[PDB]
Subunit: 455 residues, 4 copies
């Protein structure tokens, strides 16, 4: 039994010396790295084509339909007078009606198909306002029924000019229409072009009732297969990836089964559920997970190429994660050699103390996150949302973008002085505490762990 | 006595094992974290509504009243010819008179009400100039009485076109008016809209007499309750927060009282005002302070919701600080376990040596601050004020925004070469000294303190 | 033999004390630093003149030929309507025909000379489209022969106005022409001006068929000697550099030969190919390589000055690399003194363990590179290409540009939420792993190596 | 003798306990910090007034005289057609002639006074071109006499329209004129306004002959006292600063004299010029230097206030440096206490090894500086000059602005691929070597020095 256990933990070279066993798993891992990386790049070609089509069409829509739009102005684009708002609305509708004559793209109109369009209608121009809206700031009074009433005008593709906006109780104005186009660039990748439908929404938003009405354009893209097109290998490579990952999965499962059997034998021969886990190869769990992800991504990729699916983002995430895991998994064979295994050995020693330290640090970090989000968020562009606040604080801990964070508040030093002073205290205390105390101790834990495994 | 003292310092689990005492304080602390954080977010909704209303109205005013204004131009917006200045002034007044017909907001005029407005006047257009102002650069001479004379023209809401500016002795021109509006967006938060009065000040500033007259617009917002409005739970949650914090305050006060009594007994039984303080729980002082802040903020929040107060900024600071303290205070229960208490133990060991080190470092830091502020401030955008200089130097110590700091001075290398050379020496010496000597020693102090408490 | 070996490893001062040997190599090294640095600066003058001529002419071409072009707009410059595209094309051609009357430069036309120009033609205006291009998005159908057909119109320098673009199957439009000019600024450097031919390509690119057609201008510069010009020391300095480097090369080769002979004698007297290499001076290998590079660069520089060559970039790389190596090589004489040799001794001790550590780290780094490039590249401006991804990740490891990297993805939080969440996980995991674990261990290896050689 | 030597090195408290000596120097140092800092701020008021006047007038000149100028465009402002250049030149001259009617400032003309103006002339419009300039790129030939000929047109203040530019051999065009104005804002500081003369130079630069002619405006300001002006304490405070610094200088000189006498006695009683220097107080040398600088700056400040001098920059440098030294000098009294003297003790121990390390590091740093400056400077905005290259490399060592440095070269990846690859190698090697090897060893030296003096 001792000999078999000693053999179980031997390295591939040692196992070869003992039983002449071929290192099939190692060769499979190298081949997997190569083929999985190549597959990811090949998929990236199609993924890029789709993303580019959507984005470029959206930019073209912004230039075509938004009066006086220019690049980079999305965040500030707004109307400020009644005349400006009417001109923007009418320009959008007129450009919609003129699209076949002016656009560099080839678009087809879509009619009907449910709300907000009536049958035969291509464009819906809707204004939403309060049901009852008497507003008299001169007498400091108002009488409001806040139920929202929607009034829509339908425009057929080639009356809307009589639109009368109820400015004082207006909630918003929207323009809805759909356009069909063909992603011809796919021909460059030897793929059949797909048929895209873009749902275009233009919003003139008055929810703040502040005298400033921001204007935005958004699109939703739906991909469908075209009807019997005509155009005057990846399947085999995907099959090869499937077979390599399947063989790897089978071999790793066999190894895990043998490990479980040996663990059972060792426990039985002992005349704690921590020494048993020493028979479990975590690297093989990782390899099995990566094989599962790779095969799922490859099947999804085949489905997309066959035009049964269009979930490019999910497929890209699956294949990218599997590629990273495949590259990482080859470290399993460096664990047998001390000089090459510093990172993993240090991680194993350090992880418990690091997690215990994080227990204390996380409550402080979260307290700062919530305080900053709510107090500074209305005044500071970097504190708008909780995820943004976490990004800002994490970057500050690493010394990044610090003066700019201070300078964003300098405008409030004259306007809201108390908030400015609080922001000073908040930023100085956070940076000092986390860079000089917390991070130093974190690094000290890691380097001490390394010191214990140095020799 | 020994048994009672040993019981006093036992952990919640140990106290339970001894006397079966329930950990009421710990459960209260967890509940407090939850409810205080939720209350802060709920308050943030109303706070954001108010701040957004003010800011958006101000941006709309800039676009409405400043001729040729565009976003991002606030710092450089200026006039350079007499014709430009007259056109800007007249455009502001004309837009004020046209506001009801052109604006997307609904505004009401305000008349009279003291200086600078006469009774019945809505807009005051004032020019301020020297009492006597003979200026003859051709003969290198002047005769000035610098007493400022103000001349104002009053405009009623729906003669100012005859304004004649005394350019050569002009100090500034101001336009003052007030507008009333209603913050309707509060309806989305199930709140009754408030009535806002915006005091608008437009300044054409000639104090430098340099041929460039910067133009700015500023607003002051005053919030009042509207007169008998009509619109076709937070109070209970605030009450719950009050009760949780009150119970926590009472329990912590009881613990502090028992600690004081035990300290008195121990001192008396000894047949220095440093060993006595070992009977004082600093965490309970922190909890009492946080309870006081939370209750004050909650009362202020209730007052604001009832429309008796409008101090959003103070309330936000109170509630945010209390939220951070509540999150931090739960660390008290990790102090009983060495593996989880590294940060606090290191802080306690390190603080004295760190403060002594700061004694020496602070004088150097302040010397650099003053020197940079006065010598480089007129030439360097990052050295304009003392607080800005401290922000710049602190960021430099952390390696942030360094090349940009150097590059701001590169323009003076041809204009003011001596100042450029001095700035080179200043920046290089500061960065070298503080990053490589001071900060290294600071971190060494902290990690040495950690080394002493490692085991 | 022992005495000779002991003498071989003596320092220059010790060798002087032993045999009175003059330190010729050291003086040569100092002289080399001086002359090589001066030569590099003198070459930089001519290199700058050439680069400036090319760049400034290209900017002028962009302003002359691109309708409505402004600085900084290169990345977004595009057409969005048929009318815009036609106007841009015709403006480019009209400006080409008007160049002699409007341009501040003096340009000569080039005719014929092969494709795409016919004989006598100066400008070629070509449109490229699909051979068969029926596109019917209304019926979700198409019939395409993707073979590209090119149709070109030839314009002689002082019919193209009848150009009819096949928009629905258009691949791109190009404008090709060549202009000849003379780089007169070389007179300021006492050089004879060269004759430049600029090949100008203007591309209106429709390969995405997205309704947005980006417009770009690119130039290729060909330098030739002018025909018998008339204009109403560096050769000697280059000769001096050649002689200094040649003498240094000869002395270093002699030293290497003596070292090889001594190694042979020592091995023979021993009644492993690692102890023998201790007789090889790596510094002398470096010096020989630097001499070779310096001489090659100097010969190339002489050829360029004589106008036999025009390879400014290659010459600059040769001379710059040789200058860096010459400056570095003087450290050879600090190796004899422990206090001055910390860097080299630490490097020698640390290199093996560092390379072994890199073996493990590189696979993780590459996995992250590929995953980020393919998954995030279509959405993130910093992940467009593999080299850019490596630049971004390497900068992140050093704490640089981190918040901006996070913020680039914040736009997708509403559009592509799954990709945004993946980007969050990717960035947080990469930064945490590499800054806090990998880099800490790397630095620990280096400082431990230094600890071993401290005394 | 032993007792006297022991007393010599005593601390102020010990000297008080020994002989009851009053700590006059310490009180003087505190008073000096206060008064010198206040004096620096008071001077900063006047310094800011002067700098602001110059800068604002220059910006106004740019807006008045440069056709189509806007803020931030200085680096790219240029002409590209003959018509543009003529319009810019004529606009500048026309605005000069119209200045009294259009400008918001009050300016007086200056006539004559030597070259380039003739007597009675206010504006000089000069074109500079080659003496002989035949340029024929069509035949690849030229005939040039590069002697520069200047032709000037004189304009009196209220023929230049017939200007004919020799475009093909034009070197540049300049416009020179002077304007007199009065810095009235000084009244706000209770100072008499000065009389400024601005020398304005407008350059249309064609030295590159590239078809792009950059346009710039520069000013030189000369300050003079006005002739018998009329306007309808700092001298005493400056006197107080002088007296405090003089008393401090005298006391420090007395201390240095006593130290020298004691050193002589100790050496004589010994029946090396390193033990003798232990009798020299370096802090007192620093204090004497700071007193000298403070007094010089105060005398210069008095001269400027009296209007005998106008050297604001030199005075500001003197006073700022003296302020920093005064703040630093109070550390002398913390040297007597080990806990407060960590920084100085560590510096004293570390300096020799640090300087020896710098000997080796500096040659590598300089090699990189020269190589980068010459090879990358023409392509990279951050490598234009040697000082800029040093700024960039120093910032990179601290991890600052790294991705931007990489990204500046990404444009050459298609244009000049070899230079791009070299830049990749250069940047990666520099950053790796200096951040991970050099800086780590530097910090290790400093922290080891601290370790030696820890106890
Ligand atoms: C008796 C059990 C059931 C039958 C098992 C039959 C054999 C089978 O399945 O794989 C054997 C090897 C496995 O290849 P591989 O997994 O690389 O090899 C095993 C591992 O090295 C394992 O160590 P760890 O990796 O550390 O767990 C070791 O304990 C095993 O020795 P042991 O056998 O003495 O226990 C090896 O057989 O693979 C081939 O030799 C070709 C694979 C197919 C190639 C197809 C090409 C078209
Ligand atoms: C005799 C003194 C006056 C009368 C005191 C009567 C009791 C009273 O007030 O609180 C008792 C506990 C306190 O709860 P809590 O404060 O969590 O518990 C105490 C702490 O654990 C304290 O340790 P530190 O936290 O380290 O200071 C410990 O010394 C005390 O033991 P001791 O008693 O032997 O000294 C505990 O009683 O709380 C409840 O059991 C429910 C509270 C109300 C819940 C209302 C629900 C609606
Ligand atoms: C017998 C072998 C063949 C004949 C060799 C004849 C001599 C010859 O070539 O160079 C001698 C020195 C070399 O100058 P240099 O190379 O500086 O000097 C040698 C090195 O110091 C070497 O040590 P490393 O540098 O550590 O390898 C050392 O072992 C040699 O001693 P050794 O001789 O006992 O072995 C030295 O001669 O150079 C001149 O003295 C002037 C050079 C020309 C100046 C021209 C001015 C216009
Ligand atoms: C016999 C030598 C010539 C005559 C010297 C006469 C005395 C004179 O000049 O200063 C004495 C002190 C000096 O003040 P101060 O310099 O602060 O005091 C000296 C220092 O503490 C010195 O130590 P270090 O600072 O470490 O070098 C110490 O050795 C001297 O002791 P010693 O005398 O036993 O050597 C002290 O006298 O200053 C005043 O007591 C008022 C100053 C004027 C205030 C004016 C107010 C309007
Ligand atoms: C940046 N690192 C510390 S570095 O990468 O290790 C390094 C890089 C370059 C050089 S240098 O010698 O070429 N010169 C140099 C060039 C450009 C800017 C600064 C310098 N030095 C100025 C002197 N400074 C110094 C001296 C004594 C002490 Cl007590 C403390 C100090 F900080 C060290 C920096 C050395 C190290």
């Amino acid at each position: 039994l001792r000999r078999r256990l000693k053999y179980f933990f031997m390295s591939p070279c040692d196992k070869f010396r003992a039983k002449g066993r071929k290192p099939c798993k190692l060769m499979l891992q190298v081949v997997k790295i190569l083929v999985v990386t190549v597959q990811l790049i090949l998929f990236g070609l199609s993924n890029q084509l789709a993303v580019t089509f959507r984005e470029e069409n959206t930019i073209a829509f912004r230039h075509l339909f938004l009066l006086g739009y220019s690049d980079g102005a999305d965040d500030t684009f707004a109307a400020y007078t009644r005349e400006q708002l009417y001109q923007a609305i009418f320009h959008a509708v007129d450009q919609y009606l003129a699209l076949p004559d002016v656009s560099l793209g080839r678009y087809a109109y879509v009619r009907g198909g449910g709300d907000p369009w009536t049958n035969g209608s291509g464009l819906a121009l809707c204004q939403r306002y309060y049901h009852r809206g008497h507003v008299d700031p001169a007498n400091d009074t108002f009488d409001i029924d806040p139920m929202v009433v929607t009034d829509c005008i339908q425009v057929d593709p080639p009356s809307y000019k009589n639109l009368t906006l109820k400015f004082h109780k207006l909630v918003n104005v929207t323009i809805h229409f759909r356009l069909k186009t063909i992603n011809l660039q796919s021909l460059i990748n030897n793929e059949i072009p797909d048929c895209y439908t873009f749902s275009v929404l233009i919003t003139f938003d008055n929810k703040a009732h502040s005298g400033r009405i921001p204007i935005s354009l958004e699109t939703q893209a739906h991909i469908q297969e075209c009807k019997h097109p005509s155009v005057f290998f990846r399947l085999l490579f995907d099959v090869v990836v499937i077979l390599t990952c399947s063989l790897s999965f089978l071999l790793c499962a066999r190894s895990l089964l043998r490990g479980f059997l040996l663990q059972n034998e060792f426990v039985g021969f002992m005349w704690s559920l921590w020494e048993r886990l020493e028979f479990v190869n975590g690297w093989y769990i990782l390899l099995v997970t990566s094989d599962v992800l790779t095969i799922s991504g490859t099947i999804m990729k085949i489905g997309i190429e066959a035009k049964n699916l269009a979930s490019y983002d999910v497929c890209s995430i699956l294949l990218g994660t599997s590629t990273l895991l495949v590259w990482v998994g080859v470290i399993r064979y460096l664990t047998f050699f001390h000089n090459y295994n510093i990172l993993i050995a240090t991680l194993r020693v350090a992880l418990p103390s690091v997690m215990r330290f994080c227990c204390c640090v996380a409550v402080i970090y979260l307290g700062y996150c919530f305080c900053g989000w709510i107090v500074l968020g209305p005044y500071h562009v970097k504190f708008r949302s909780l995820s943004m606040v976490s990004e800002c604080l994490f970057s500050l801990i690493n010394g990044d973008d610090m003066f700019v964070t201070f300078a964003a508040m300098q405008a409030q030093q004259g306007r809201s002085s108390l908030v400015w002073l609080f922001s000073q205290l908040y930023l100085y205390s956070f940076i000092s505490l986390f860079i000089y105390m917390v991070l130093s101790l974190f690094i000290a834990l890691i380097t001490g762990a390394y010191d214990t495994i140095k020799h």
